[PDB]
């Protein structure tokens, strides 16, 4: 995030980190319940990547987090590689998340929900800070 | 480098499709929602993340980090997958597995 501020540990409990075998972080994701993760389609997740819930400081010899395994991936059939439209994927967990105090799910909107322009929202992640 | 070790966050305004289009024009498809250009920006490593908005006291998933300025420009609207639109599929997918 460019121009963001460091967050308070455990305050965005739904936020996970998708990493590779070597532990390399390539995309964020959100917890929607103990067995499902919602992420972007272009992240190209695969059954061999890992979901990591519980973190905050990626640079910690060892913390108290969960490494979950990917049961199954579902890219949405309508995703357009060229237009980037319908960029979504669901990851089904092999092992459910133990919800905790640092591990919760986010609420899902209703199809008719209306979010007004000018409203203030938030976004979080571990993405470049400078370009 | 510029790869934070510690989770980050930012507060930003949702844009209306119209005002988004003033920048990205037709590139703005239907299952897309814009926000930002307020002085912050999502950037490399942020995709798949979340964009939350307070609904009735609770944190709701409004969009998913998608793409934008090829440079993480802060004067430029960022675009995300608009959950509202993608929702049913989600539901159904969930429901069937």
């Amino acid at each position: 995030i460019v121009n963001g501020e460091e967050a308070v540990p455990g305050s965005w409990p739904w936020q996970v980190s998708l990493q590779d075998k070597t532990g390399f972080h390539f995309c964020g994701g959100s917890l929607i319940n103990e067995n499902w993760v919602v992420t972007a389609a272009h992240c190209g997740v695969t059954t061999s990547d890992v979901v990591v819930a519980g973190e905050f400081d990626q640079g910690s010899s060892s913390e108290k987090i969960q490494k979950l395994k990917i049961a199954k991936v579902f890219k949405n059939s309508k995703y357009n590689s060229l237009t980037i439209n319908n960029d979504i994927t669901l990851l089904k967990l092999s092992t459910a998340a133990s919800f905790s105090q640092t591990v919760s799910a986010v609420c899902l909107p209703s199809a008719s929900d209306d979010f007004a322009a000018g409203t203030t929202c938030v976004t979080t992640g571990w993405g470049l800070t400078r370009y | 480098a510029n790869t934070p070790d510690r989770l980050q966050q930012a507060s930003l305004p949702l844009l209306s499709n119209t005002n988004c289009k003033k920048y990205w024009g037709t590139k703005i498809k239907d299952a897309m929602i814009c926000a930002g250009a307020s002085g912050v920006s999502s950037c490399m490593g942020d995709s798949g993340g979340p964009l939350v908005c307070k609904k009735n006291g609770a944190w709701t998933l409004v969009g998913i980090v998608s793409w934008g300025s090829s440079t993480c420009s802060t004067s430029t609207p960022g675009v995300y997958a608009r959950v509202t639109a993608l929702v049913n599929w989600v539901q159904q997918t969930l429901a069937a597995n």
Binding site: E5, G10, S11, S100, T102, V106, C107, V122 | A58, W59
Partner: peptide, 11 residues
């Protein structure tokens, strides 16, 4: 959902 144990701050 959407109610963290630990309240986030500023944002």
């Amino acid at each position: 959902c959407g109610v963290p144990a630990i309240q986030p701050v500023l944002s």
